[PDB]
Amino acid sequence: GTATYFQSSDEHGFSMYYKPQVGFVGDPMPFYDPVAKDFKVMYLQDYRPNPEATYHPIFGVATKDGATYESLGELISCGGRDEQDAAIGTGGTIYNPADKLYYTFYTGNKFKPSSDQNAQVVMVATSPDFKTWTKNRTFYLKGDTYGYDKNDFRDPFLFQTEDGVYHMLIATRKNGKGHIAEFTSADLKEWESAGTFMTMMWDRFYECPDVFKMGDWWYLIYSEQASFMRKVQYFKGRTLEDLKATTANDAGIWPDNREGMLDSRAFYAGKTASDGTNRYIWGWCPTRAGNDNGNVGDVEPEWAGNLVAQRLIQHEDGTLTLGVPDAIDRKYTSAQEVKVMAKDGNMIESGKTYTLGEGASVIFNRLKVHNKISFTVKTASNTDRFGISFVRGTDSASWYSIHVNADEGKANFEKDGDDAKYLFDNKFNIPADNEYRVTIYSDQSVCVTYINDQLSFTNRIYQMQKNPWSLCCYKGEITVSDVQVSTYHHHH
Ligand SMILES: [Cl-]
Ligand SMILES: [Cl-]
Ligand SMILES: [Zn+2]
Numbered sequence: 427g428t429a430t431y432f433q434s435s436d437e438h439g440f441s442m443y444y445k446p447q448v449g450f451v452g453d454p455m456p457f458y459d460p461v462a463k464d465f466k467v468m469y470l471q472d473y474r475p476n477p478e479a480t481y482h483p484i485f486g487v488a489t490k491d492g493a494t495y496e497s498l499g500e501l502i503s504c505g506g507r508d509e510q511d512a513a514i515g516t517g518g519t520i521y522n523p524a525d526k527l528y529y530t531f532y533t534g535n536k537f538k539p540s541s542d543q544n545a546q547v548v549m550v551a552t553s554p555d556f557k558t559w560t561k562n563r564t565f566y567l568k569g570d571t572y573g574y575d576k577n578d579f580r581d582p583f584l585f586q587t588e589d590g591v592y593h594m595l596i597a598t599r600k601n602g603k604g605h606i607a608e609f610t611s612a613d614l615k616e617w618e619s620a621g622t623f624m625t626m627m628w629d630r631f632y633e634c635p636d637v638f639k640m641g642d643w644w645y646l647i648y649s650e651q652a653s654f655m656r657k658v659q660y661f662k663g664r665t666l667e668d669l670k671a672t673t674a675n676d677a678g679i680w681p682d683n684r685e686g687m688l689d690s691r692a693f694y695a696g697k698t699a700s701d702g703t704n705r706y707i708w709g710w711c712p713t714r715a716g717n718d719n720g721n722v723g724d725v726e727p728e729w730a731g732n733l734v735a736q737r738l739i740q741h742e743d744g745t746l747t748l749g750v751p752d753a754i755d756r757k758y759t760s761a762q763e764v765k766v767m768a769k770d771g772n773m774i775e776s777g778k779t780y781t782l783g784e785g786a787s788v789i790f791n792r793l794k795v796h797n798k799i800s801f802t803v804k805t806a807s808n809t810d811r812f813g814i815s816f817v818r819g820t821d822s823a824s825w826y827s828i829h830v831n832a833d834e835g836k837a838n839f840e841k842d843g844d845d846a847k848y849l850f851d852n853k854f855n856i857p858a859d860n861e862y863r864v865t866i867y868s869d870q871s872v873c874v875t876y877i878n879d880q881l882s883f884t885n886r887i888y889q890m891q892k893n894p895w896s897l898c899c900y901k902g903e904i905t906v907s908d909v910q911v912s913t914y915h916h917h918h
């Protein structure tokens with residue numbers, strides 16, 4: 427009925443983009459449990475603030491589908507203040523059918539290490555049922571034992587190849603240069619160094635590496651540590667040696683025309699797992715200081731937030747994009763009436779289509795709490811620009827928009843209105859036919875925008891829930907059609 431701004435909040439609760447009752451979701455460690463036939467997503471549990479020295483214990487959630495989550499609680503606790511794993515960093519899980527134990531390798535971060543100590547050491551815990559985890563008190567894998575780094579030696583990724591060999595990939599350095607080191611084992615207990623799997627481009631550092639085969643392609647997914655990037659990226663190759671060659675001697679053989687950038691700065695630490703039908707990626711969407719959508723960090727965003735699952739889309743040429751998990755899409759079952767609450771500028775309404783010239787905007791009726799928004803936008807030219815706006819009340823001085831800038835080949839997240847400012851961007855393939863098929867899935871303040879199976883754009887938008895949303899044209903002219911909204915909760 428109203429289209430004024432309302433001060434919504436996140437206390438109502440999340441659902442598909444999970445958050446624990448207390449704290450926030452840091453780096454996830456997804457794993458397909460071959461016995462339970464579901465996904466176990468371990469994750470670094472973050473608190474605001476964290477204790478000194480002993481922080482980021484490993485908690486877990488279980489999910490069949492990336493939409494419905496069961497809390498598993500604390501699984502691997504921090505070591506004591508003075509122990510090697512006082513603070514725990516990211517690792518990886520794998521099942522061993524020979525001894526029927528789950529193995530989780532992880533990073534032990536020493537508090538205030540001395541010259542002779544290692545800031546980071548890879549350690550392990552096992553469990554027969556995924557509920558009770560037992561640390562191996564004699565396993566300590568040190569980078570400098572094998573010529574790698576004493577202090578950067580982290581994020582172990584585990585996979586078993588078809589020949590039965592277990593592989594562990596660890597993000598580290600050799601003589602300062604970033605190296606993903608490989609170790610091999612027959613039993614997950616005794617390990618040998620296989621040298622360097624891949625070097626990291628230039629002075630980059632690849633957090634949370636993830637290597638897998640999908641169809642006829644091998645992939646490395648990683649999260650760039652460099653502050654100017656802070657995005658999930660990937661490389662591809664038809665063979666493992668082709669994959670490893672993409673960065674050899676800084677070759678920079680990008681997998682596609684966007685340096686393999688899958689999402690932008692509000693989706694981080696993405697790693698994958700497959701149930702044999704779909705391969706999903708789990709990452710986190712950061713919180714914002716003061717819950718201010720325009721405070722995205724001076725250098726890097728805040729660390730940790732909400733768990734976000736996406737589905738890998740493999741294209742005929744082997745490139746990857748991300749789409750919504752089908753089970754998330756199916757959560758939005760309650761169709762809502764779509765009504766125009768406000769129009770401004772040079773535009774025309776043609777029934778259930780709207781054509782907006784430069785400067786024009788249409789405001790639609792208030793969203794609910796967990797929303798699926800869909801519509802089609804056709805631009806007049808391949809250099810036009812349009813906006814998808816949230817938290818835009820008729821009385822709002824500022825709001826937040828995804829700018830789709832066809833002339834620049836990318837979508838931006840920006841603050842609009844008073845104190846407008848560009849925040850970050852997300853390159854994607856512009857449609858030759860100028861048609862943009864848009865879907866947005868939201869869960870309170872977390873949403874992902876998908877376009878044409880090409881763009882996947884996660885954003886933190888506090889108070890998008892229970893507030894109007896809007897479409898606008900910045901440059902050129904657009905026609906909006908087929909506007910639909912469906913919600914999670916059902917009313918009568
Ligand atoms: Cl809802
Ligand atoms: Cl309900
Ligand atoms: Zn709800």
